[PDB]
């Protein structure tokens, strides 16, 4: 991505609570992943573990 | 750091190894990391968060 160096946090919670998780869950992602989506995503994945099909 | 485009994945696990973890941990908090010392602490900090005192 064009900038891998903080920014912003908010957009980030918004980012990852559109993936279908609580706020509560993505404030910690965000939290654990020095504030970045791309590496929050991971967590989330671990913490949940969504399904498909 | 000085750096953090991704980079050699060895030099990252040998380096949280130091720290107290198994190499089962920290290969697989690596991988969440986005293969990023920075954050993988936070995350074995949440596997595991080991004591001090």
Same mark, same amino acid.
């Given at each position: 991505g064009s900038s891998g160096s903080?920014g ?13 998780? =609580?706020?509560?869950? +993505?404030?910690? $992602?965000?939290? #654990? =992943?020095?504030?970045? +989506?791309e590496? $929050?995503?991971? #967590? ?10």
């Open positions: 903080s912003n946090v908010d957009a980030k919670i918004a980012k990852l609570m559109g993936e279908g998780y =609580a706020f509560e869950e +993505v404030k910690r $992602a965000l939290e #654990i =992943a020095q504030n970045n +989506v590496v $929050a995503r991971s #967590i989330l994945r671990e913490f949940s573990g969504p399904s498909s099909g």
